[PDB]
Structures are given as C-alpha cells and as structure tokens.
Amino acid sequence: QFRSIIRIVGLLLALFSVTMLAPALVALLYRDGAGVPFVTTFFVLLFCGAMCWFPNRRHKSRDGFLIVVLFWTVLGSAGSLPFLIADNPNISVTDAFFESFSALTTTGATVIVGLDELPKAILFYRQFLQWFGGMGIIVLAVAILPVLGMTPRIAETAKALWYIYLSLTIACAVAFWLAGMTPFDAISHSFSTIAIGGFSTHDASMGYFDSYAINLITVVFLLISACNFTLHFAAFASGGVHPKYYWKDPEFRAFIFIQVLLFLVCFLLLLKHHSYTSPYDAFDQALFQTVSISTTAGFTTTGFADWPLFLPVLLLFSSFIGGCAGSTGGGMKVIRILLLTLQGARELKRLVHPRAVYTIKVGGSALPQRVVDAVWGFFSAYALVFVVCMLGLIATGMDELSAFSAVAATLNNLGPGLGEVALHFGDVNDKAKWVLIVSMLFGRLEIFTLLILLTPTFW
Amino acid sequence: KIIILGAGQVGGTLAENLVGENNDITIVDNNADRLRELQDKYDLRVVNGHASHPDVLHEAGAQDADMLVAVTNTDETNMAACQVAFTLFNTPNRVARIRSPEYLAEKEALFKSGAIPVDHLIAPEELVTSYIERLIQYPGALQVVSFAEQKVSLVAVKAYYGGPLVGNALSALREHMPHIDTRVAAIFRQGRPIRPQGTTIIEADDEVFFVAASNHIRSVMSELQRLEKPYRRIMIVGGGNIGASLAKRLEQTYSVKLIERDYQRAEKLSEQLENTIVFCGDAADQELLTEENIDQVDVFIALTNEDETNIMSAMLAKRMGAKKVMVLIQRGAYVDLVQGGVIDVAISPQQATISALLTHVRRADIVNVSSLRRGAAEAIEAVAHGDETTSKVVGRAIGDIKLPPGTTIGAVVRGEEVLIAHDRTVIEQDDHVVMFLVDKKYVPDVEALFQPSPF
Amino acid sequence: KIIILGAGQVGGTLAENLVGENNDITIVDNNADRLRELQDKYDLRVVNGHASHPDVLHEAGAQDADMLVAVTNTDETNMAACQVAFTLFNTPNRVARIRSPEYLAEKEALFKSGAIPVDHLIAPEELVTSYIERLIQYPGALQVVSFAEQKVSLVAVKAYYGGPLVGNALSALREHMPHIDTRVAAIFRQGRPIRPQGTTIIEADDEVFFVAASNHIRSVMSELQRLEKPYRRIMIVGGGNIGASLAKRLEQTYSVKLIERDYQRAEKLSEQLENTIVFCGDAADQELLTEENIDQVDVFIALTNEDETNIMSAMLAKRMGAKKVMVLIQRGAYVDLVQGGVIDVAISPQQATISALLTHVRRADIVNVSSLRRGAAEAIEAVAHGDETTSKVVGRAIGDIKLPPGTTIGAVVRGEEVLIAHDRTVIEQDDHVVMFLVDKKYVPDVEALFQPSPF
Amino acid sequence: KIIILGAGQVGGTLAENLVGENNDITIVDNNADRLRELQDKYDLRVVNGHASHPDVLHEAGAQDADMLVAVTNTDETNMAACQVAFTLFNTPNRVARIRSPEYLAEKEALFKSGAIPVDHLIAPEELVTSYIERLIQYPGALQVVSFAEQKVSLVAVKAYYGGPLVGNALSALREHMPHIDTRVAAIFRQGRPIRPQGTTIIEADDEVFFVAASNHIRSVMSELQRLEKPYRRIMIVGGGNIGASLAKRLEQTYSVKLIERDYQRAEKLSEQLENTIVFCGDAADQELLTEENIDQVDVFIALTNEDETNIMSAMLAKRMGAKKVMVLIQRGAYVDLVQGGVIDVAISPQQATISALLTHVRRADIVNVSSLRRGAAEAIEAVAHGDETTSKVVGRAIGDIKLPPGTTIGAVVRGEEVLIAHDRTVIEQDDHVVMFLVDKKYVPDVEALFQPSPF
Ligand SMILES: Nc1ncnc2c1ncn2[C@@H]1O[C@H](COP(=O)(O)OP(=O)(O)O)[C@@H](O)[C@H]1O
Ligand SMILES: Nc1ncnc2c1ncn2[C@@H]1O[C@H](COP(=O)(O)OP(=O)(O)O)[C@@H](O)[C@H]1O
C-alpha cells in the first residue's frame, strides 16, 4: 500500500520539529551559541512535514516494516540538520549524519572532539536525541510485536511505560545532582543513562568527575534500565505488588547471573595483574566497566592503559549479550541466550531419555516452535550480517581488527569499540562511516526489519 | 466500563460494536484462538480464563465495572458464572445468554430479583428464528435495519410478479398512504442501482428501500402484508435446534416439509414434530426437491451447519421455482457476497442478535457508525459534530452538501423527533443523520465529510 | 426418599449400595442408560430427560423428600441442577459434586457461608487419589475396610522381599507389639489360603490379613511405615484427569515418569507438569519400559480409560520388576477375577467411595452385610438376631458353631468395645460379630447360619 | 541375497529369524515405521518405495535379485507388484500374499500358469491361521512347534479333569505305545516345573511336552484324538475377517455362537452366516455369556482387533467354565506372559505364518536357533560346531555335559535320521540338537556351551 505512508512521515518529522524547541529554549537560556541553526531546522522540518502532509484522507503488514525503517532513517536525517547548519562544530555532512543517527539510534558513537568546550545547546540536543530514541525504542519494542520482541490495554501501557521512563530519569538526574553534578550535566546524563545510550557532554564520558557515587548511581540505574520494563510495570500497577516479582522472571535471573559472573571474573583478573593500586578502586572500576559495556551502554571511566587487553575484549563479547528484551539494549537480548542454554539442556535430556516430550519452558509456560525457531533465525541473520559489515569496513581500507571492533560496537548499539576506535570515530574512513551508520541501523532494527527490505521476495 | 464473556462465537462482534467513548471492554474467553482474532480489534484488553471462576471475576467484581455481559456457548455454565459473580461481587448490571430454551419457559420463576441465579436480562439465539418467522410473515420483507434507538427504520422490500408493487409507479405508492412520510433511499434493478423518483416499479424483482420513522414503517409493512398474498407452503433444510424450533413455531400456520442428512436425527425429529413432514436426504440433490414439489414451494429456508451448503442448495431451489430463498450464513464475507438477487436474504445470527441488543444502545455516537448490510451497499448513521462552520456539514442545507456519489441522506433525527430529508432542511449540531450509500467504499469519504476541522 | 441423577459414571454404583433403607428409593439417570440399564439392573424407580431442566426433577417428589444425589460429570451444570430443585421444588437434604477444582479450592470459604446455592454437602470423585497416596505410603498395604461404624478395621498387607516381614515368624510379629490386640485372619500364598498360627511368613508376595480395632490398625500400620523403606520411583501410564492430578500431587515428593499415547496431550502435560518426565508412547511396548528402567520402578499405576489395557500393561510391569502394581478397574467383574498376586491393587472409583460411605451410612445391619474385595475371599459383618436359643448362634461359643470351611471370626463388637474372639469367646452377644470367609460362595450359608427359625 | 517387500505386520519378524545368517539382506520399507527399528539395529540394507514401481525394484533387484518376497496388505497391488518384478528387472522365486478368499478359491489355474507370474508359493495369512480349527480338532493341543525341517516336533498337551491322561502314570503312557519313540521334555504343574519320569500327572491341569519324530507325533496325537471326547460347542467373540471365515469353516461340524459389538457388522454376519447364531454385545459383560451357556462351552475363541480385550474376555470365559481358551495376540510381549496360565493357547498370526514358512523352506543353522513359545520356557535347536575337543560339547556324552539349570536335551537329529536323546548317546559334529529350557534366561549360556574355541 504505497503512498499512504508519507502522511505519517510528515506528521512524525513535524513532531520532531516541535521537539527542536526545548534545546533551542536552553540555547536562549544561556547564549553559548548555535541558536540560529535550531530555529532554521525547526522551520525547514515543519515545512517539509507540511509538504508531506498533503496526501491526506488516505488510510488502509508489509507497510509497518517501511514505517519503522523510516521512523529511524527519516528522523535521523532530520536530526542531522542542526550539526550541518551550526558553525562552532563545523563538521562534514557525513559526520553530521553519523552523530545524529548514533545519538538517535542509541549507539554511543561520536565523531566530534572537544565536547567540553562546545555550545551547551548542541551537546544538550545530543542527550535529548538519546532520550528521544529511548522513548522510540521502548514504545516500538513493546507496541509492535509482529517480528521478534492476560494482555492489558494498548494505550494505558503506552503511558505506563512513559511514566516509568520519566520517574526514572527524574530520580536519576536528582541522584546525580545530589552526588555533586551540575544540574545541566545531571539532566544531560540522565537523558543518556536511562536510554542506555552512552553519550556525555564531556570527552571523558564518566571521567570528568571520578566520584565513587556517580559510578555507583550509573551502575544502579543501568541495571534498573536494562530490566524488562514490562516487569517494572508489575512494580507500577497498583503500586509495589511484590519486591520479588522480578525474581520470578528467569530472564532477570540469567541477567543477574551474567552480570555477577562477568563482574567477579573482571575483578579477579584486574587483581591478578595488579592493574590498580587499591582493591577498593579495582572493585569500583570493574563493576562500572562491566555494567556499562555488558549493558551496551557505552560509558567509559578509564583508558584501558594498565588493563590487560583480555578484559576489553571480554567486555566487547559481553556487549553481544546485552540488555533484556523489554528495555533499551543491543542485539541478542539476554533472553535469547537463556533460550540457547535451555535448548542445549533440552537436547542433552533428549539423549538420556530419547522417547520423552520436552518443551522449552520459560517461567512455567511453554514456547511455540515458531518463537524458538525465530530466535535462531535471528542468531543466523546477526552473524551473516556481522561478517558482511566487517568485510565492508575492511574493503574501504579500515584497519581489520579495528573493523571487527567497530562492527561489534555498532551492531551491538555500543558506542565505543576498542582498538583504533577507542574514544573517537573521527579519523574513520568516510565510506566505512556510512557502512557503520548502516550497522547501527541494523543493530537497532534487530537485523530482520531492515534485511526484509533488501530481500527480493518482499517487493 | 463493560465486561463480557466472549466464550461464545457471537461475543467478538458485540465487542467490536461497543468500543467507543467511556467504554472499557474485558474479554474472559475460555481459549486463545478466538482471542487472537478478537485481539486485532483496537483498544481491547484480554484475560485468559474460564468464564465463571472467581479469579477473573474478582478483577471484575472488586470494582463493579458497570455492566457484565455473560455470553457463553453453554447455558448452565453461563448461569453459574453470572451467579458466582453476583453473590461474590454484586455486579447489578449483569446479563446472561441462554440457548436453553426450556429455561426460557420458567424464566419468571427462577430468574426474578432476589433469587440465587440472579439473571437480569436474557439474550438468546432464538431471535434469528423469530426474525426468520417475521421474514416469512411479511411476503416481501427482504431486510430491516434500525437506526437511532429504533426511532427510524430502513426496510428493503422485493417486488414479485403478481404482487401489489408490480406495475405501479412510485407516486401511486406515495398516494396510497398520504399520511405516511417515507423516503425511498435507493432502488436496485437487475443488480444495477437506479435514481428513484416518480418511476414505474419494473416487475423484475426490483428492490425498494424505505427509510422512515418506525411508526410509519410498521404501518406500510402491515399494509403490504395485507395486500400481498401470503405464503402457504414452506421448506426447510436443516435438522438443527434452529431448524427444529422454527418448524415447531411455523408448522401451525403453514405446511412444513423439513429435510435432514442424518437418518437418526430425522427419526428423532419425526417423533417431536407433528404436522411437519420430515425427510432424510441432502439439501443438494434435485431428485428429492423436484420429487417434493419444489416448483410449488413458496420459501426455501436453509439452516445447515455449513454455509456453502446453504448457499448452493438455496441457489438451486431458487432456479427450480422457489419464490423466496433464505440462508443461514456464519461468515460475513459470504453474506456480503451472496445476498444479492439470487439469494433473497442471508441471516447472520451474530448480526441477528446484535441488531436487537445494539438497538437498545443509548447511542453509537461515532463520526460515522454503519450498520452492516447485504452488499454491495451500506446504510450509516452519521452524527453531525462541530460548530456552524468548523465542520463541513453543520449549519448547511441538505441540498448544499457535497455528498459522495450514490450517497443519499434518508432521514434526520433531531432530539426525540424525526423528520425525513427534504433538500430544504438544514443540519444542526449533535443531529443524527441517517444515510444510505450505494457503493460502500465511500464510507470514509462521508466520515471525512462529517469530521470537523481537528481541534 | 432417595433420588440420584444422570447419567453418572459412578452414580449407578451409588444406586446399588444405598438402596438398603426401608424408606422408598428412586434412581433417575440421564436417558436410556439410566432407564434401560437402570431398569434391567435395578429395583424400584426412575426417570428420564436431559439435565438439568426442571421438568425431570419434580419426579423426585420434593415434599420433604430426604435424599438428593447430584451425580454429574461437569460441575457448572451440577450447581444449577441442584438449585433449580431447591427454588422450584425445595428438596431439603442436598449433595453435590465439584471437580472444578478452583471452586473446590474456594468452596470451604464460599460454601460454608450459607450464601452458596443449595449444596452445602459435597462429594468429590477426585479425592480417591489421596487413597492412592496412602497406598504409596505405608508400603505393602493392599487394602483396608472398616466395619461397625469404623470401629473395627480389616487390613490386607503384602510382604515384600527385603521388608521387615520376611523371615520373621508370626510369633515374632506378635511379640514386636505386645500392646496391640490384633487377629490374623488368613494368609494367601501363591493364591491358596493357609492356616496362619505359628508359621514362618514366606517372603515371596505373602498377603496377610489383620483384623483389629481402629486404634490397633492405625498403630501397626504406622509401625510398618516406620520399618519399611519408603517408595521413591513411581510410573504412571495415564494422561487422564485423574492421572494428571495424581502426578501433580506426587511430583514434589517422588520422581514421576508418566506415559501417554496422544502426542498433543503429552505436550499439554509437559507444559503443565513440572518435575514429572512425561513420555509419549503405548503403555504396552516393552521397548519403552525396559529402556526406561522398568526393572527399578517401585510403584506402577495404570489410570487408562480401558480396564483391559490397565490390567495387561500392569501385569507386564509386574513381570518386568515393579514392586507394587495398581490399576483403574471400571468393572467389578474384573477386580473380582484378576487381582490377586499378579495385580496388587485396583482402584474402583465406585468401591473407593462406597466402602467408606456405607460404613458411615446407617445402619448396614442385616443378617449378612457384605463388604467385598479381590478374589474368592470375603469379609462380612454378620448380625446375630433372635432370642437366647431361637438363633443357631446366639449364646453359644464359636468353637461349637458349625461355621463353613475356611470361615474365621476375627472380632466381636459390643457397643463401644471390641473383643478379638480368642478361644472360648466369652460374649454378651446380641451384638455384632465380624467374620472372614475364604470362599465367598459360602456367604448364603452364613446367612442361613444367622437366620433364625422363620416364624 | 534375499529381498523382502513388506509394509505388512509380519515382514518384520521375517527379518530376524531367516536373514542375517551367512547371507546379505535387503528389505523394502515402503515408507513405513518398521524400517526405522531395523535401521536402528544396523544389520540391514533397506530401500523405501511403492510396491512395485520400477524405480524401487531396479535398485532392489536388476536381474540379480535372486529370491523375492512380496508381503502386502492389499492383494491387487501385491499381484501387480509381483508381475512388475518379473516383466521388468526379472526376478526369480517370487511369492505373493493374497488374503482375499475369492481369488484364493479360484487360483486354478490361469494366475500361476500364467500371465501374472506369481511363481511357486502363494502364502495366505488366513488359511495358515485357520490351523486354529485344528486346535479344536485335536482336544488338548495347547501347542506344536517344528524343529529341523518338519522332522522332529514338540507338542504341548493339557490334561483336563475327566480326560484320559489324568491319574495315569507317565510310565503307562510310555507303555501304551511301545512302538512310539517319544521323550517327555518337561511338565509344568500349577506353574512350577517338574522332572518327568514315572510320575503320575496330577488332574489339576498339567501341561506335558512331547519331543519326537514327526511320525510319532502324528501317531500319538491321533491316538489322543481317539481317546478324548470331541468338543461339540464352540463360541467366538470376534466379528472380524478371521472370525467370520472361521465360523464358516466350523459351523457345519460344531454348534458355533458368535459375538460382535458393531450392530451393522452383526447384521451383515447374520445375513452371511447360516447355522450360526450371531449376537450383538461386548465380549466382556457376563450378562450375555451366562445367558448364553458360558458354563457349558468347550472352546472360547477371541479374535478381536485389540489384544487386551481378547485376553480379558478369555480369562473371564475360562473362569466361567470354558474348557479350552484361545486368543489372538498381535503383540509378542503379551503372548509370553498370558499364554502360560489362564489362556490355554495364544495364536500370534505373525508366528503362525513364520513357523510354517521358516520350518518348511529354511534349515535353521545359526548355532543355537530358538522357537518362541508359551511361558518363561524356551525350546531351541542348537547346532554342534567344532571337532572332538575344540568345542565344549562335540564328541562327548549328554550325561557328562554341564547344562544350565532346567535345560533338557530332547532329541538329536543326525543328518536324515532322528534319535531320542539318552545320557549314553554321543554327539557328532554338525548335528542338530533339539533342546528344551524351563527358564529361558539361560539361553545365552547354552550358546557358550555350543560356541567352539574361537580361532
Ligand atoms: N447436506 C445437508 N443437508 C441437509 N442437512 C444437513 C446437511 N449437512 C448437515 N445437515 C444438518 O446440519 C446439522 C448440523 O447443524 P449444527 O448447526 O451443527 O447444529 P446445532 O443447531 O446444534 O448448532 C446436522 O445435524 C444435519 O442434520
Ligand atoms: N496404552 C494406552 N492405551 C490407551 N490410552 C492410553 C494409553 N496410555 C495412556 N493412555 C491415555 O489415557 C488417557 C485417558 O484418561 P481419561 O481422563 O480417563 O480419558 P477421558 O478424559 O476420556 O476419561 C488418554 O490420554 C489415553 O491416551
């Protein structure tokens, strides 16, 4: 049903033009600069939305894929205008599309250096893009269940999620400012610590202030934000119904198991090498770096200077097993890994007792073979996209090991990959920068929503 | 806030109608296939549980949630559910669906207020049977739909060769009852529609659609009942509870021959049914119908389990000489397709219950709310919302509205008074307009016409 | 006045033991099964028509008519069934069956309030399982029945190799509890009975019959529970509503392997049943049983629909190495025939309730009142009627009575006290004497022995 | 290189006894279940395909198949397949299975002369199964098995109360035919074995096993036929394709009462069957058997589809008074367990065909080869391989062999002569020894006795 979509695309980037005012208001609040680009982009986008809101009075499965693909592509290209117009960070069109997509696609990747000495309006709009894509991620993931992903109301949960998503970012900006954080930096870092983005207004994501409390609070609200928000709904609906409503969800149990194991192995390894002089410091930095990278957030508190290269490599692989399915996160949500383990156990039991009926039981209920087949179709598509992205970056002359790290960082919706891409995506080849944008789009779209568009059988 | 028990097949359609302003619906279906289908309807919340168990009931019960509509396939379970509900949680608006019917005989004894069963209103599937009887009572009554809480009623009648409609110009029909204010919506002839005004009603099965207040409709249909020669012989082809109960209710006034495919069912019927010649054969074979005076039967009613068997047997009995043909269609895709000309009327039992229960609904009150029909035509009941100029249609005159093609305004219900649409009339705020489309793909265009400038 | 209702899986059997009251008995089943079967195998009354329409119920009378039995497969119908009777017909003593069991879960707070409709008295057919659980405990406890209002209890125990009974002479069993006054009735060995005083119990599947006061039985069975190592492996071959709920009740304490032939049912079980390994195959093929450690299973329970499949599969699991074998027999002719030695215990859902209820039922005092078991054996509770000399047996001593062959008197109940009837049998007896036959075809002669000279 | 083409039930058993000994095996799975079990075993080559599309045949046999075995459920397809084998990819020693009676009766002579090349054997699974009639013909013929190539035959007879064998000492039976050289292998009494020499056979019904040359067996069985009073009345509880044709074959000489559960089948039988009173009821209910003189019937034949129904009905007719009881067991696991004690003879039609074909055509030479039978006993036909001292058993005397417990040597076949085994006899290399085990779990040890010193 082609040509009935432009109406929504126009109304959507009109909403995004309206979203442009809040950072513009912050620009007029204190005039660091960049006020003109914001207003210019607002008008250009509302005008484009009206041009695309002319085919009206037209409304009638294959369309929804092209809806969400444009909800990320169109909105990223719309968000790529403020960087294009402004003067203080004068960056190429490619770096602008990159920064806009990564801000919106929740991948913490950045291509602008000198964030500290930058107009407070722009580096606010960056965190606001992360917060926006946080809502987009949460709303889309829980409000569209055709691919991957008692039944309550549609809209009442569409607003209960927004209520959790705001009662969290408020309490987190509050705890940050209570820990000695600029209220500006507190809002800008709650926009990005709940959306699991990985962005900061400083070149050192979480090294600008080394307060222990800031690290522990970021860890806490990362664990809170990686958990299935449908499960927080159980803590929201009719108040605090249980404090162990969480522990029933075996996805939560596997998530805490993974986080604790990866933590204590990173801590023991960080002590075998005496990488930090004080174990009270090694504990902090280990827990924070595991919770940051395992949760595909992208925050960094250290430069890996004394760290043995194994620990950053382990964190990159840990990024593969990201957040839970019902929350912001990277690819291969902890539930697909719990399913993989459970199926290995099932196949083991089908060898001792062959003529027995075993079914993949998650939290007491059995799973239809369509879902369990989809989880492994997803593993296959993920792998066969990873390899193509890596070979694409390598083809453009990018460093190979660095290519594999940049791919595993972007397809995982993890902003920083170790290697040549340790703290900036600046000197990356330009074609590799476009292929990287494609990779982050893949990682957000769960490798299926976008690949289908490429398939000939679709068209 | 409404709770229903969509254990029965019908419930889903009722759920579709109810959704709207200040309405919250909960489905307590026994199993999830029907659930997946029903879930697609927008703005719904479903819980999976047995109908009558207190766990689901407590969710309903703890907050009274206004009306509880207990519609279930099994009657004893529906009654037990409605009672466990009330005497656990009061739920004073409770309703029940019993296809008992024997219980319907003693409904004044067990059900009355203060008793343990605690049933307030009973909705049965018997109405389709009564509706079919009404269809057989009026010789040319192809269809009736009701708008604005039964204030205005649209009727679709058929002109049979030798009837009183045949050969008479529409102006003579208008002059035969000078005290009746009716408005002919459209006239379908040989499948194609026609603009009707002062025109001779061609005998080839012209279908005429009246739109008027229910008092006038009840008068013109009774007059057509008096004029048209009543049907004498009637034939039915299914053995079910509907075929049986319809033969029972009709046999006293007409000569009924019933057909059955299950020999044991035929044997069990012939005992129960007196004055009804009960046969044993497929509704398909001509060798039985011709052998049974198919050329002389007046109305051929098909109440088989299978819809396609109804359609085909009745399409064969229409060719062989039946005057009026009726079927029982359980698939809306079929009823929108076959009810045209070759099959005089298809009776969806879901819409058969809904029309009766929905008529009581205080108001549909949606920018466009349609009543599903034979096809490919539609009759909707638009509501005029908006200020004098913020809406396309409020404050202006009927002759000045740019209605979609084939769209004909039939009547306007203002408050509690009904006036039939002359081109002079002007539409006001919150006025119900009863309309008639000839091509239903223009339903959205009418909504856009009635949708004001968005706030 | 007694009524029961149709159709009744068990109810028919509830209609044979309960007819012993002098007052009028009536049984009305559902339709032909109740009438035809009912008339042919039954004695004084009945009835017809589907349930639960009120028209069939008034035949019960309900003018201070004392007994109402609502035997029903489905609960939701049963509650309404009993209610229509009370409201329309007002029957005073009401009883009900609920297998909901969520209602069975909440009925102790709901039904013990008086608000509930009409069925305070309850009877569940699915609480026979608890008896299977008792059988799984108290290892080697084949059966127990109670006479004289549960005053005296006969018990049939099995001696397993490695148990505490092997090798020990009956005198050592008598000395192990010098405070228990029990009476060894008979000992069946390889099917043939044996004189038991002072003999060494042969380990291979000896069946020993105790008769003692309920306190003594409750103490010796707990002592045997303490000595014998409890069961740890249980295998079930039925997916039925009984098998499932038994697996639920057992899975937490034992390791359960369950078998089903219908794949979809097996899948539904593996979803519902946690900690229970649920299989998909015939209970007949050895290629699955041997492959699944049939030689190591402790208790093999057969709960299939068909009795012959239970009997054959369980005789095969008995041959292969199962220690205790249990089956579900729906035909008393089978339980009287196959179940000795090869099949340790069959759970007749009819006799499982009947044995307890008849004992609790008044008065059960006739010249002969028979509680029947498996085999040619018999356990009777004869009543000595007549004056000091008008009866063959009153006032005289058991050693002087010409009792039939193999017949052994176990205990004598007067009032509230029980005597073991050792030697001379000093007695008061107007009063109730508990006996034990080895061949039950001598039941009438004992009636003749206790029947006084007819006037 | 032998090819077997069977989707039928019997072929699987034909895949173990006759193939795998010094020859290559190929089977046709026909896209069925049986192919999976043999493939799991892994000593087999199989091709899946329709019988007989040339594509399957060409791989199966391409003018090099040698022996052909066509086993099919349906006759017309089996015939077309057997001829397709000849004309295309011509094969030799082809065989067909025609279960249809009409073709079998009119086989002469165009079908084998003939355009359809159904060369040589035409094995019908029915006429060989009507050997059940011969079991009624020879009263007290619980079983007969054939060793070597129909040279020495073991027979299991039963001594009935009132028969001619009761009370007579085994030495008198041995002296009653001084010209018959037979050897009683073992004697089962009340389930326990006994050493048989000069011991009076107890009336309670013993099972005596003869082992002798076929001439002696044919003479002693005819003499026992003369002595035992023939069975006048026969009863059958299966309305199947076997039961019908058995009633036809028996009705002329005996009074046959047949039972069926499907009314329409019973009616079709009562039409087809003359002189045979055909009933309509379950083989389980006593109210029909007692009503039909079950206490006076001689032979109770159970030919139901279900094995467990046969077993249970026949255990009930045995309890009620039937002299000889026979069942139709389609599950090898059941027949061993049930055949011993309360079912006089169980006739698995698979072993019924196998025994005839295997004993006739195939000379079993697989070290110790065995015949499946009744009870825990086994009867094997070991082959003595090795020189005077490399083997444990060649060259030595029977009295000096350390045979497993219960193992009794019955006869020794030397080439073309048969010897009744004595402890003083000498064993020669490559001589067939016909044996008899009482407990078959010692079958493997006998293999160790006959296995020569490994090279
Ligand atoms: N080809 C046929 N011709 C006539 N009657 C038919 C034919 N096929 C089915 N029927 C009737 O339809 C009945 C099934 O109707 P159904 O709607 O299932 O019954 P119910 O009224 O209980 O819902 C069958 O019992 C049979 O009598
Ligand atoms: N060997 C077997 N033969 C037949 N049925 C079996 C066997 N093993 C298990 N079953 C199962 O027994 C179950 C019957 O349980 P039950 O609840 O009595 O049936 P129903 O619900 O019809 O009463 C069915 O699942 C049946 O498949």
Ligand SMILES: Nc1ncnc2c1ncn2[C@@H]1O[C@H](COP(=O)(O)OP(=O)(O)O)[C@@H](O)[C@H]1O
């Ligand atoms: N309980 C029973 N009592 C008597 N006959 C039975 C019983 N159950 C099944 N039968 C009979 O079993 C027979 C089926 O065998 P048949 O049709 O010859 O081939 P198949 O064994 O393949 O069905 C039928 O005659 C059926 O009536």
